[PDB]
């Protein structure tokens, strides 16, 4: 199923059937909301935020616990990403591969991975533009 690779891995997370908060969970919904803001103010993305809440605070999931996505929770409190999680990580990886490439002008493997990374950016950038989350004038680097 992988693009740009022959791997057919199926590793992933399996959401539980129940869409109600665990009966064992006994902390207020709001106290999560301020807590989410606190890391996000510290600078953790919605991805890492969810990892910490579940790992240390028993938050199995942000929708089941409080009914809203952490982004929407953050968006409600005036916080959001500029460019999406997915695209944001691709740019830095493209940056890092490039920042490698000038010093090492014989990395023929690395340059190939750059094309794979760049083409992935273009597809992802194309679609975020279509949904209008990214205004049209945006172009990669």
């Amino acid at each position: 199923g992988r693009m740009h690779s022959a791997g057919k891995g199926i590793s992933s997370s399996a959401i539980p059937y129940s869409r109600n908060a665990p009966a064992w969970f006994k902390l207020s919904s709001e106290s999560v909301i301020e807590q989410i803001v606190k890391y996000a103010r510290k600078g953790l993305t919605p991805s890492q935020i969810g990892v910490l809440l579940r790992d240390a605070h028993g938050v199995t999931q942000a929708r089941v616990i409080t009914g809203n996505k952490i982004m929407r929770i953050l968006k409600s409190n005036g916080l959001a990403p500029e460019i999406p999680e997915d695209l944001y990580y691709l740019i830095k990886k493209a940056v890092s591969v490039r920042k490698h490439l000038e010093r090492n002008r014989k990395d023929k493997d690395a340059k190939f991975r750059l094309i794979l990374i760049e083409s992935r950016i273009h597809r992802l950038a194309r679609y975020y533009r279509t949904v209008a989350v990214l205004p049209p004038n945006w172009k990669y680097e």
């Binding site: 890391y39 996000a40 600078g43 953790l44 993305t45 910490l52 005036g78 959001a80 990403p81």
Partner: peptide, 22 residues
């Protein structure tokens, strides 16, 4: 957590960066 934290992800963060940039 601190090593895992990023200075530049959130619209508020670059707003801080935009604030200090000018």
């Amino acid at each position: 957590i601190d090593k895992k934290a990023k200075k530049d992800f959130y619209r508020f963060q670059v707003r801080e960066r935009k604030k200090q940039e000018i």
